[PDB]
Amino acid sequence: GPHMATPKANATTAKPASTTSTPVYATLSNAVTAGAAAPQLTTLFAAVRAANVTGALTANTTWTILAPTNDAFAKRLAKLNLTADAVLKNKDLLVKILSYHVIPSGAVYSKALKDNATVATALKDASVTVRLYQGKVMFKGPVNKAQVTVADIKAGGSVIHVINDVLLPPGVVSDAVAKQWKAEWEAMKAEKKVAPKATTGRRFLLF
Numbered sequence: 001g002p003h004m005a006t007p008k009a010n011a012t013t014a015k016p017a018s019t020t021s022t023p024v025y026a027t028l029s030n031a032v033t034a035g036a037a038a039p040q041l042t043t044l045f046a047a048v049r050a051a052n053v054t055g056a057l058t059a060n061t062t063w064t065i066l067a068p069t070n071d072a073f074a075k076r077l078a079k080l081n082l083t084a085d086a087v088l089k090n091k092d093l094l095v096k097i098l099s100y101h102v103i104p105s106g107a108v109y110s111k112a113l114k115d116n117a118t119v120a121t122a123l124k125d126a127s128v129t130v131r132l133y134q135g136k137v138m139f140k141g142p143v144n145k146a147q148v149t150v151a152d153i154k155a156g157g158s159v160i161h162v163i164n165d166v167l168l169p170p171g172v173v174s175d176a177v178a179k180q181w182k183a184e185w186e187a188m189k190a191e192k193k194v195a196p197k198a199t200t201g202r203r204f205l206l207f
């Protein structure tokens, strides 16, 4: 018989903006404005904003982002012995790192939260392990681990958690730095062979 059909098409865009002060947010826009007003996420917002990724934050969008306090960046930065400006100007690294900070896996649930339960980030070949301790959600990766200090941030459409430290993907950490942590396991003397991929430390001041 008569078997004929047609294609489909649909799309929309919006750029809302409203600065308010309340315990519960209405949408992503509300969440961002909240963190932006507080210096607690100065560094983070500094990268997230400059990165121009905020555009992704829309309504009816379920996502899990990690907003680590300033101390976090200052910690990992001091330990890695690197410059922030060099990265701030480097869009490549900006999104490269921020990508991991985000979790497209979706709003995690306490019921699903487990010790072995792993989470997949936006960055390919990047995942973290879930850990339960003191009724808190702890994260652990291949290099450097952090713990969620304040979570359950009332948001609209999406959800964000506050961490004390920040985590970085494989390859971003230098050999020397990464070695400092590897030494802990090296002491055992029983693992697989691993080599570097890229180096870092290219920045000079000029007036």
Ligand SMILES: CC1=C(/C=C/C(C)=C/C=C/C(C)=C/C=C/C=C(C)/C=C/C=C(C)/C=C/C2=C(C)C(=O)[C@@H](O)CC2(C)C)C(C)(C)C[C@H](O)C1=O
Pocket: 031, 032, 033, 034, 035, 038, 040, 041, 048, 052, 053, 054, 055, 056, 065, 066, 067, 069, 095, 098, 099, 101, 102, 122, 150, 153, 160, 162
């Ligand atoms: C862009 C983009 C993509 C990628 C987008 C990324 C990677 C976005 C990253 C966003 C972040 C990281 C947002 C963080 C957004 C973070 C936000 C909104 C954080 C809010 C934090 C708050 C309100 C914290 C509050 C408190 C604090 C901090 C305390 O310390 C307590 O004491 C008090 C209390 C009140 C609990 C894509 C790949 C999908 C491709 C798309 O085509 C596209 O276009």
